Amino acid sequence: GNMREIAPKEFVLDMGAGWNLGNAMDTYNSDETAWGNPLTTKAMIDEIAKMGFKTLRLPVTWKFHIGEGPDYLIEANWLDKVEAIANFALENEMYVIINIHHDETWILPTYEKADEVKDELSKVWTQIANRFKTYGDYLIFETLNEPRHKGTPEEWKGGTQEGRDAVNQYHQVSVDAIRATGGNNAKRKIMVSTYAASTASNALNDYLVPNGDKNVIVSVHSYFPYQFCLDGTDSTWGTEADKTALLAELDKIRDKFIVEDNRAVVMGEWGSTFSDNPEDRLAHAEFYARACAERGICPIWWDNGNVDEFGIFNRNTLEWNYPEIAEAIVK
Fold first, then answer.
1. Is 205 in contact with 157 (CB distance < 8 Å)?
2. Which residues line the annotated binding site?
3. Is 249 an annotated catalytic residue?
4. Distance CA 207, CA 252 (A)
């Protein structure tokens, strides 16, 4: 239950390297096994910690467990599940990040919907924060995952001005709600994303930290370069031009947040999908993770459980599918 007096940049160094429990509690279904992953167990999390990951990111989708307004009650048994997994990590001496994940349908960043969204968000964050209020500073809240207007031309390009404005307002509501619960929540580290967790320059330039809160960490995601990492249209990686382009991405993030803004950064998702390309995936993981570590940015690999996609740990057998990726990230 202890809260250190600790600056965000040292806290982020202490977070080490992380791993996402993807397609689990974040599954967009009332049944969190619907996306193909078993119910999470401590035995699973134990292997994540034994491999040397220091941070578990525990993405959670809340939509199917939130009741009607104006109270928007979160089901107690859902909180129980979240808490249990969090404790699996904390018992392993890990940091744990809990977020709001695939909840965009009630978090649409438009002026039209803002007023209702801000009402619901305040109620939901109050509830999550009160459940977890007595936990110490190894538990971190991440207010929103990739808040954006899905299906729009600027969705993955940093949004429109209206969308970035609304996203900033939703972070404002969420931080305020967390801090108003008091206790350890007045001091807890909060990860606050850009629009979409984008690294687009407009998203970088328009980002606002609510109240200038000194315990806010910046959250961005960068599956760089996307042609290799996401689309599978390029399956090779490792030229000097590839290296230079990735370092330029990372230097953009460093220059804006770390140097100009005096903020620490968690790269709360990155990684590459499997494209019949193990050697280049490994080279890219090694280089990316090293580049983040040299900059003081905490890298958190996205693992969705699916070996044909982002899964590097086998949750059903407790073995690593791709142990060398894992090792390249944590060394």
1. no
2. 234, 236, 242
3. no
4. 14
Residue type, 205: N
How far out from the chain centre does Cα 226 lie?
18
- Give the phi and the psi of residue 57 in degrees, each rounded to 5: -95, 125
Q: Obtained via which technique?
A: X-ray
Task: Tally the residues of the chain.
Answer: 331
Stated in angstroms to one decimal place, the resolution of this structure is 2.0
Question: One of 104, 142, 154, 269 is an active-site residue; which one?
Answer: 269
Q: Which residues of 138-157 are buried (b: 16+ CB within 10 A; e: fewer)?
A: bbbbbbbbbbbbeeeebbee
Residue 269 designated active-site: yes
H-helix or E-strand containing 55?
strand 55-58
For 272, residues 6+ apart whose C-beta sits below 8 A from its C-beta are 223, 228, 229, 237, 281, 284, 285, 310
Give the three-class secondary structure for 141: strand
The CA distance from 97 to 138, in Å, is 8
| Tokens coding 61 | 């989708």
The active-site residue out of 104, 120, 146, 154 is 146
C-alpha count within 13 angstroms, C-beta hemisphere, residue 263: 29
Architecture of domain 1-331: Alpha-Beta Barrel (3.20)
